[PDB]
Amino acid sequence: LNLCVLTPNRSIWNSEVKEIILSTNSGQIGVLPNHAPTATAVDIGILRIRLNDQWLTLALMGGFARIGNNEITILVNDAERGSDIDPQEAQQTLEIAEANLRKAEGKRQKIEANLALRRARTRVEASNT
Amino acid sequence: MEYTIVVAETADSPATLQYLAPYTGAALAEYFMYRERHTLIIYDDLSKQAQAYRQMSLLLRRPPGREAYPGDVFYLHSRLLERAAKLSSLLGEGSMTALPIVETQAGDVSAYIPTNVISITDGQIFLSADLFNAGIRPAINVGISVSRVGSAAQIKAMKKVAGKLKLELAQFAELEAFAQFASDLDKATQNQLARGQRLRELLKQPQSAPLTVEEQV
């Protein structure tokens, strides 16, 4: 399907593909050749492309997707290439994020750290992938 | 030329002929002038004449002064320029309206020629060479220009026709001073700016077109 992945600064994976799959609020769905017209938000979690040969992770830290007539319009909030992140590096940043999540008190700072840990487990996750 | 007299010295004259033809014009002026008429002189130019007297006393090896003019050239100019007057009615109210060309060597106002030239002249009329480069002959850089009697002979017609124009030109320079900042010129700024830009269009004439004092006012 025509994945038009689009950060709020770049059209990320504008490659059309064989397969993609997504972190649903049900937990994950998969895209489907001529899927439903549907739309889905994705939490801070790795999207994936099981394109023609490769199944690999698209590390998004938030966003939505208009799944039209085999027409993915997947606009993330911040979609890293999980291939690109160094596993040790983002694992270390994840370690610092879990530690600072143990450090930050106070509702804005606590939520900032927890969502930072959310995107950081996402970062480490496709970094582990 | 019926109403005129062409004082003609070729460029290749005697430097004394250059250095004295001023006095010849002075005499011919004095004729109609002590014939009590209005009269008018137009010297073009004393600067070449200044070069001439420089060359003359220079050929004498009389040691010249600042910028190689000999000193009395101004005095020669004072020999020249001090003739012109709307004379006494006791003398007969004869007017001798002399006004010379004054060569702007590179716009250097401290040319010793220009330096003297101002010092005699009761009016100083500095032209607009940038507007000459804008082709905008009649091109007069009106701020640097000056004349003592601005309205004592400008008519009540002319003065009550153009005092607003005078301040309109001045404020045209004012809203022309630094109009490269505001980026949406308000009708205060822009309407005075295009009114005075229109004035910049307005003083412009095809050359040799002496318009009527009627058409002027």
Binding site: - | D12, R54, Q55, A68, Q105
Partner: protein, 247 residues
């Protein structure tokens, strides 16, 4: 120069011909007469001139004349003495002069023969009274095309011509063509080049400057407009190039 003027004054009267007078360099002649004042022991003037160097300069300058039989028309060469516009030597020369003209380094760099200064000439006879508002209006618009083109040349170098106006895209291509059609086959170029040297008619230049200034000939490449002073020659070689791409 006096020997020159007398030998020319034969043919300006005896032939009564249109006496062309090429004289280089006039500033060198000034320096020579300055040296003559030096060797004279004359108290010579300011920055190095003779006192009557103005007078001698007139005396040389005056004889260049359109007399009623022949017309002594002169092109001379002022070495810009230290480029001083404040040079009284350059002042005296420019007083004698009628048409200040540079010849373009940058358009010999742009390749144009003849490498005339597209912006750095000056024409004192260029009143529309004098020159003709045909020529004067046409060349004023030509100068404007040149002015805007070179003036925002760096702007389009930053921007692309796409970011420039279509007006400018008309102007920049138009003036590129204007410089290109300004490249003309000189008669003396026929030796060194071999193209036949077009003695370009004034009206040919008028119509060509009209056409490119109109953008009526906007289909002509500057590639096609280059090396072509003559207007119909530019459109004709546009056809010749169109056929050579077609053949």
């Amino acid at each position: 120069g006096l020997t020159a003027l007398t030998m020319a004054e034969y043919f300006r009267d005896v032939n009564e011909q249109d006496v062309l007078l090429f004289i280089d360099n006039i500033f060198r002649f000034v320096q020579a007469g300055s040296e003559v004042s030096a060797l004279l022991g004359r108290m010579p003037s300011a920055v190095g001139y003779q006192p009557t160097l103005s007078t001698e300069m007139g005396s040389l300058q005056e004889r260049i004349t359109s007399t009623k039989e022949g017309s002594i028309t002169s092109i001379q060469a002022v070495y810009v003495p230290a480029d001083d516009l404040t040079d009284p030597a350059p002042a005296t020369t420019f007083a004698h002069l009628d048409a200040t003209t540079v010849l373009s380094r940058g358009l010999a760099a742009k390749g144009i023969y003849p490498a005339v200064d597209p912006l750095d000439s000056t024409s004192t006879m260029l009143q529309p009274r004098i020159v003709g508002e045909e020529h004067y209006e046409i060349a004023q618009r030509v100068k404007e095309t040149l002015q805007r083109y070179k003036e925002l040349q760096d702007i389009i170098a930053i921007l692309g011509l796409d970011e420039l106006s279509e007006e400018d895209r008309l102007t920049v291509a138009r003036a590129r063509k204007i410089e290109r059609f300004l490249s003309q086959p000189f008669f003396v170029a026929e030796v060194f080049t071999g193209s036949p040297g077009k003695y370009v008619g004034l009206a040919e230049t008028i119509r060509g400057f009209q056409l490119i200034l109109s953008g009526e000939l906007d289909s002509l490449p500057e590639q096609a407009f280059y090396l072509v002073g003559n207007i119909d020659e530019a459109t004709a070689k546009a056809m010749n190039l169109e056929m050579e791409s077609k053949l």
